[PDB]
């Protein structure tokens, strides 16, 4: 039955981190009295922890923004290839944003080129699509939410080669259509482009804020 | 105002993991942008990252078990110093309401 106790606290650790917050410590032992033949167990903790503050901001790596708008599907130093069997190219750009304090630069290609046809302002024959899937009830949480589905005059895309094989290094290109065409179709309900319909959503639940719900 | 400083933001559940401790400002805790902060144990853990919308939650159960109803899901802007997409302060939410059908008749 010997009552043990704490010894001297050791040297404090330096602040580990060079930015932000960190945690330091001191170590003590139960070595001077020592519980012998039973007793207690020194009463407490053999370790204290403390927050150290360097007051200097930390690196943040840059992230990619969303891709820009596609360039026009024309040829450099020529004219245009609209309404024609001519595969062209177009480019797109990204922007690295948010890089501060010697952070890592954005990884990847900042440009994107893909091959294309041009149906910009091209008169194309059309056919009405079927009814689209019912949209979201808008406005959510507002007075009287309503859905919306629609039929639109879908253009008949011309039967062009979707795969064009160039030479040089024998590179074959997945070619996709670009542009806003002018779809021609017969009127449905007094409208030429898009005819929609709305229906109210039934048994609308009230919106309760999750921070207001937990409390 | 001082705040509790946590070392990790879970993001899958929005909880504050790994308590570095308290008695420290929000500016000094959010120098490391991988950290997170909350006031006491009440909740709302905000990461020290630049503000960005979280993941859309799972769809709520449909308001009726019969015919056409309506269901909600939320998304909370989490972050510090800045705004989310749409002039949204950190803490505000956005909802999507969809028509559901547990049983069609």
């Amino acid at each position: 039955g010997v009552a043990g106790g704490w010894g001297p606290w050791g040297p404090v650790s330096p602040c580990p981190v060079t930015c932000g917050l960190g945690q330091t410590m001191e170590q003590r032992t139960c070595n001077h009295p020592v519980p012998q033949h039973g007793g207690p167990f020194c009463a407490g903790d053999a370790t204290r922890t403390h927050i150290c503050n360097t007051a200097v901001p930390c690196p943040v790596d840059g992230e990619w923004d969303s891709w820009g708008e596609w360039s026009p599907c024309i040829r450099r130093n020529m004219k245009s290839i609209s309404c024609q069997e001519i595969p062209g190219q177009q480019s797109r750009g990204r922007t690295c944003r948010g890089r501060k304090f010697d952070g890592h630069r954005c990884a990847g290609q900042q440009q994107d080129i893909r091959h294309c046809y041009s149906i910009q302002h091209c008169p194309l024959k059309g056919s009405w699509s079927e009814w689209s899937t019912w949209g979201l009830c808008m406005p959510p949480c507002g007075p009287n939410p309503t859905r919306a589905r629609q039929r639109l005059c879908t253009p008949l895309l011309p039967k062009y080669p979707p795969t064009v094989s160039m030479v040089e290094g024998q590179g074959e290109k997945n070619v996709t259509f670009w542009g806003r065409p002018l779809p021609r179709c017969e009127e449905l309900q007094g409208q030429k482009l898009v005819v929609e319909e709305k229906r109210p959503c039934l048994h609308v639940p009230a919106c309760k804020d999750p921070e207001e719900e937990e409390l | 105002d001082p705040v509790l400083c946590f070392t990790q933001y879970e993001e899958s559940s929005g909880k504050c993991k790994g308590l570095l401790g308290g008695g420290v400002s929000v500016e000094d805790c959010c120098l490391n942008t991988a950290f997170a902060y909350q006031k006491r144990s009440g909740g709302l853990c905000q990461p020290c990252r630049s503000p960005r919308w979280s993941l859309w939650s799972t769809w709520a159960p449909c308001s009726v078990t019969c015919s056409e109803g309506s269901q909600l899901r939320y998304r909370r802007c989490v972050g510090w110093n800045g705004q989310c997409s749409g002039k949204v302060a950190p803490g505000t939410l956005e909802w999507q309401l969809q028509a559901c059908e547990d049983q069609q008749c």
Partner: nanobody, 124 residues
Framework: QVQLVESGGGLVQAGGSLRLSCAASERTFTIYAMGWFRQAPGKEREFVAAISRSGENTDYADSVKGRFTISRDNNKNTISLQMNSLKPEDTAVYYC?????????????????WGQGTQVTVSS
């Protein structure tokens, strides 16, 4: 930055005991969380045991739990691995590892400083 020197390996009979020790750099000792790894013949390096900067928090692999014990002496800049009930599958080069830890009770499994190793061979 920090240098690590292992000692205590050798040839042990099966069922016997061996105590390894790892000496680290003196001025930066309490900054790094530390641990033990091993690499058997023909196998990848595997985690054995970890200890925090405190010496109060420990973590062990399932293959060595109950047989091995990791300890830390913050007076003498050493850690130790007391290996009991040794089996021929414990034959490996045992490595001491050091890693920067923000919290003093955190045990790590990822480490960026490694010693040269000590050879432990267990004969049946």
């Amino acid at each position: 930055q920090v240098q690590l020197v292992e000692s205590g390996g050798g040839l042990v009979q099966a069922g016997g005991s061996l105590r390894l020790s790892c000496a680290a750099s003196e001025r930066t000792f309490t900054i790094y969380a530390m641990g033990w790894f091993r690499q058997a013949p023909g196998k990848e390096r595997e985690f054995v045991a970890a200890i925090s900067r405190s010496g109060e928090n420990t973590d062990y692999a399932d293959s060595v739990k109950g047989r091995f014990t990791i300890s830390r002496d913050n007076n003498k800049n050493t850690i130790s691995l007391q290996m009991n009930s040794l089996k021929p599958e414990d034959t490996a080069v045992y490595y001491c590892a050091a890693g920067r830890a923000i919290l003093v009770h955190t045990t790590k499994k990822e480490y960026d400083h490694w010693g040269q190793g000590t050879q432990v061979t267990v004969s049946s």
